[PDB]
Amino acid sequence: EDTPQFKIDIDQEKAQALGVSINDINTTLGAAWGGSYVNDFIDRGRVK
Amino acid sequence: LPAGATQERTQKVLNEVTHYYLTKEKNNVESVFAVNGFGFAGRGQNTGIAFVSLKDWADRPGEENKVEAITMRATRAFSQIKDAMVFAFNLPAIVELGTATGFDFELIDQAGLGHEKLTQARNQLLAEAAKHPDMLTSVRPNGLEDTPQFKIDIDQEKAQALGVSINDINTTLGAAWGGSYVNDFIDRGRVKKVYVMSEAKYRMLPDDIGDWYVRAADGQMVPFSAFSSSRWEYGSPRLERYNGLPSMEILGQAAPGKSTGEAMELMEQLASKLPTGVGYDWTGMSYQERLSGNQAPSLYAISLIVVFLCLAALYESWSIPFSVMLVVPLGVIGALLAATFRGLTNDVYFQVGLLTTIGLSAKNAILIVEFAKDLMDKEGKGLIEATLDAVRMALRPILMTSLAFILGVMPLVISTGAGSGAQNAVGTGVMGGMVTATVLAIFFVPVFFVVVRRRFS
Amino acid sequence: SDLGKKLLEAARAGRDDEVRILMANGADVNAADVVGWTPLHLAAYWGHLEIVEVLLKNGADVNAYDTLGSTPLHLAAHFGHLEIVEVLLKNGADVNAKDDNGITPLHLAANRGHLEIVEVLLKYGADVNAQDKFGKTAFDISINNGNEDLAEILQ
Amino acid sequence: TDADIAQVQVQNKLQLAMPLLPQEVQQQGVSVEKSSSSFLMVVGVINTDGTMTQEDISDYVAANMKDAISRTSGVGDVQLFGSQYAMRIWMNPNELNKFQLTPVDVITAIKAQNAQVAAGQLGGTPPVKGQQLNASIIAQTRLTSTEEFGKILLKVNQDGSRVLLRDVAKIELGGENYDIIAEFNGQPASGLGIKLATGANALDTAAAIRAELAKMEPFFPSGLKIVYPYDTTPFVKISI
Amino acid sequence: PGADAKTVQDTVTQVIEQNMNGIDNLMYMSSNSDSTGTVQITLTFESGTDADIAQVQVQNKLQLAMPLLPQEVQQQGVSVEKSSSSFLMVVGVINTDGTMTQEDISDYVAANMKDAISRTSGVGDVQLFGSQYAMRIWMNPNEL
Amino acid sequence: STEEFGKILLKVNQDGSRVLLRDVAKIELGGENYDIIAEFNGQPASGLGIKLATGANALDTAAAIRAELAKMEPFFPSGLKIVYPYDTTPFVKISIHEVVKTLVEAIILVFLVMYLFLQNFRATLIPTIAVPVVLLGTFAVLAAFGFSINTLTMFGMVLAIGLLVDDAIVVVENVERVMAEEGLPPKEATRKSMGQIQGALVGIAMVLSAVFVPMAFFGGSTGAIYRQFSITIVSAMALS
Amino acid sequence: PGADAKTVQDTVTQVIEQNMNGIDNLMYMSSNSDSTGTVQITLTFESG
Ligand SMILES: CCCCCCCCCCCCO[C@@H]1O[C@H](CO)[C@@H](O[C@H]2O[C@H](CO)[C@@H](O)[C@H](O)[C@H]2O)[C@H](O)[C@H]1O
Ligand SMILES: CCCCCCCCCCCCO[C@@H]1O[C@H](CO)[C@@H](O[C@H]2O[C@H](CO)[C@@H](O)[C@H](O)[C@H]2O)[C@H](O)[C@H]1O
């Protein structure tokens, strides 16, 4: 069934007015609240 | 050549190898294909192969002008060469299949021990294997040893302080010293690559590192030495993996007299005494042998059972079939005598030769027993009477087939030309096998039948 | 020389028996590969204590430096070979030896966090205020790596 | 229908769509499987000594067992009942704002300072005449520990003080995801949910799985033990 | 290009190896990563396995793993070949009057010979021992 | 062209002077890599590694390759020459030739031996017909099962000659004896002669099948080699 | 996209065609390269 979801509207005019890029906003929101797979590292000889 | 040996040094050795083959083996060698920078066991500037092409077999009479002779002479000649491991060797019969002599062992890191600890565990196994010359011979790593490498640390703080980006630093280093595939261009209507790289003389020695400048945000050119430090360390020039885990391939073979199966069982015993988290497995020829060896007993059993069942139906008795099956050794002894004398091996060609030798000897006996039995059943003749009448009738056609077939394989035995190694393995085992099978069976087959008939009824 | 190159491989491999025979036959102890590593450099790196002692007994240069100015004490201290660090220092290894980068055995020992070796080096008079080409001390490395135990020692 | 050809045809068309998919989706790895919808068996893994948590067991299974089982013939799909470890950078927004930094700066710094760089060689080909030295140049390598990720330099302030990644985030080894948590009789556990490849024999595949599990057991850490909490194949063998 | 054994292993070889799943009749997998910047992963299959089905199943799993590899490795690309095969003959191409380098000869063979030999009746595969020309920009750091 | 790459603009200075790529780099057409240096008798060398196509004829393919290289001869730059350091066709040429030789010499030997004992040309002609018929038939069975003319299958027929030659001699020799001992005409002699051996010949066929057929059921590389000799010898024997 | 027939033939069609050797039961191969940057290489195989 449908569930409550938190709808957030980015104001393009305000973002442009304050000199805040939409790429930085979307990454900041997405990385923090969603998680971001940046790159790989080696944990005891295995790529992870 | 030894660790860190350059292309120019490897070339000078290949030049000596090429010079030898076109000087000392002028009568035998047609060409030398010198490939500097490639080896089957690992690549690099310190490795290379010289593919020697000989003249026609007809222009190389006698064993003195054959590959095995030239190989021995070449290997001895190149023994004197300093700071280089140089030796000649023949190609495997089937190049598709590989060497296929000895065993193929994989030492596996099963618990993330790392390269250094797997090396120590490998050295331990090789050392323990070297204590058993009577069972194991030439137990060695297939891969390459660790070599000195130039570890350069980029100081992040100094780079950020001077306003030099890391991408610019790592691009400048990689592109100049390593080379960089930028994009494609079209040369006379064909797409080809564009490579940017340092001119040789500016990417040779560590002092050249400091001659490379990167532009900072403020537009100042900063030398590489300003934000970098360097030290020597050791690392692998060739890392191996088996079934997704770090591994090291070890080649070896059974000592003279000992079988490969025995040599494998010792390697397994030695492997079980290695440090915690170090496993092993068998690959290639070894993997193939273990599964093939497990099939052999059941296939020999099925073969003997059906042979007996067919003969039992033919003669309508459980006992008489034994009189035919007792010929097997009469042919096999002759093949082995001929093989042992001429100095050949128990090879595929010899093994198929035994079966055809066994086959025709069995056929000779089958007809003697059939005629002997028929004379006893129908005409009501006695055991000895029927046997004497059978061998009398069977003498001529056995001698005709034997004489014809022995003369027929004579060219294969004495052949020394192209594909003679195969012809020898075919003819030798068959000729010797036929001689004893012919001479013995005519006297022993009647003994088998008479003795079997006496024992059972 | 031939024996000189056999000693380098023997010292690296840790073949105590082969080193003995080479010392008797007089294999060059100052023999160096293209990177400038002596048998003592190699023995110190791979952690072969008994061979380090045998080479020093046969007049090996304890303060030998490679083409980047690094010594056996640098290698021993960096890869956590406590007993080899002690033997080298006892035979007069320069405790304040600087490579071309201005890096000392103490810097390297501190970076890998070898607490025992840091105290052995400091006991033999390691300069705790010694700076590399970037102006960093053993203390600067300890607080950057976040090694509190090591940071406590260097005061 | 031949499952091999079906898979080939399905993937041929997927490869036309792949470039149009978001970069984040491509980098998670898109998979094409031919298997039953139901599980052939569940291979359970527990620690009887209680020396390893559900998270520890899940990582070990993912890192030392899953891949070999996934490569076994007849194994169509393998579901890890748990997650493999990832380097988790748990960001703090208060600390990020304090040093005038964002998740964009953190991602840029990690890509820059957790890098495997191809630096070339000393005396590399084509070389100059009379070169004696040939050696690989080693620059930055992948970071291996929480400590190394911790001392990643984000910025240097005007006074000269250093802002490290550990100053704006907590750093630990933790699952790629924290969605799947398994138990065996109320006890911390991981496991592999194995699905039978289309047309493959259930009993032969089960035997091949047990043979591959047998090669792993000897090299287990103390306490770790394979359990068999769900298998459909014993019924097939016994019923016959 | 310009990568060490460890760089190749930890960015290419390990990533490909982890994605070699769901492939039928695989006996064992072996690989080596060397300091020339090269990786070779050989997958050996059961005797009687269709080599075409084996190859395409490997190719298909590689394709989906390509976005996980470095940008420089995606540029060069990753070849999937039947390696179990052997050579019928080796045609050598040489220069006797010393006017052409191995690079000059390799380019001529690539441009004017290889394709025609590939189209010849009964020819299954043709491999150039060398490479076609590349636009080489040999940089000078003093001038830069 | 290298000329165009030379003219690539990098920088325009304040005074107005232009910095091109040729000012900061040497530009030429070279190799993709310089790791390998190939020489043929000291002279610079390249080459082509040619593999045989599935179900193709090696001797026809090599001839076609040499014919195609001959058409390229006129367009070669001055100094360029073709050489054949490795070529496997001489083997197969001699392998087939030496096989044809052995089977011809075998028929010639049978003729002499048949005449030496039986002393009539009519008797010597029956094996001279029978042996070729069986050999040709063996190739048809070889083709049917998807086998090729190769070293193993070729020596497989040579190893079977004894069994083929024997069937021919046994049948004819036994008829000649029956006539010599009983005085029956050829037709009545053959009816009785075949009546004595027909049961055994079928028995022999079943026995020899049991010896060679199981050899074909070995697995891996060894099994593949054995299967070449097994199917060739059993087929030749079965037709005989 | 955007490439002429000559450009796409040299960079795509010939690159693919020169690798279409040693395929079983190949009767003939026909291809066209057009001004929309489109390449189509059709391989026709023996009956059966
Ligand atoms: C005892 C006689 C009994 C009769 C039955 C025996 C038949 C002969 C046995 C060998 C069968 C194969 O025979 C072999 O066929 C291939 C074609 O596939 C030929 O192959 C080659 O022939 C000639 C030889 O100069 C080449 O120029 C040509 O390029 C190529 O076709 C071999 O020359 C031929 O010897
Ligand atoms: C003219 C008629 C000719 C008859 C031809 C009959 C066809 C030949 C059938 C071959 C089938 C293979 O035969 C099968 O091989 C497997 C191995 O792979 C054997 O399996 C074997 O495994 C273990 C291995 O340790 C042995 O110790 C054991 O003796 C045996 O069971 C089977 O017991 C056998 O039944």
Numbering used by the authors:
A (entry chain A): 722 to 769
B (entry chain B): 578 to 1034
C (entry chain D): 12 to 166
D (entry chain A): 98 to 337
E (entry chain B): 50 to 193
F (entry chain B): 242 to 481
G (entry chain C): 50 to 97
Extract from the study:
Efflux transporters of the RND family confer resistance to multiple antibiotics in Gram-negative bacteria. Homotrimeric AcrB is comprised of three protomers that cycle interdependently through the loose (L), tight (T), and open (O) conformational states during H+/drug antiport catalysis. Characterisation of resistant E. coli mutants and structural biology analyses indicate that the compounds bind to a unique site on the transmembrane domain of the AcrB L protomer, lined by key catalytic residues involved in proton relay. Thus, our work unveils a class of allosteric efflux-pump inhibitors that likely act by preventing the functional catalytic cycle of the RND pump.
D408, together with D407, K940, and R971 are essential catalytic residues of the AcrB proton relay, and the interaction of the pyridylpiperazine with D408 likely interferes with the H+-translocation pathway. From the identified inhibitor binding pocket, the protonated piperazine moiety of the pyridylpiperazine forms a critical salt bridge with the side chain of D408. In addition, the formation of a salt bridge between the charged piperazine ring and the carboxyl side chain of D408 reinforces the importance of the basic nitrogen of the piperazine ring for activity. From the crystal co-structure, it is apparent that the pyridylpiperazine EPIs bind uniquely to the L protomer of AcrB. Firstly, by binding deep in the TM domain of the L protomer, the pyridylpiperazine may sterically prevent the L to T transition, a vital process involving major structural movement in the TM domain from an inward open to an outward open conformation. An alternative possible mechanism of action is that the pyridylpiperazine impedes AcrB from using the proton motive force as its energy source for substrate translocation. The reason why no pyridylpiperazine was observed in the T protomer may be of technical nature, where the transition from the L to T protomer may not occur in purified AcrB due to the presence of the stabilizing DARPins.
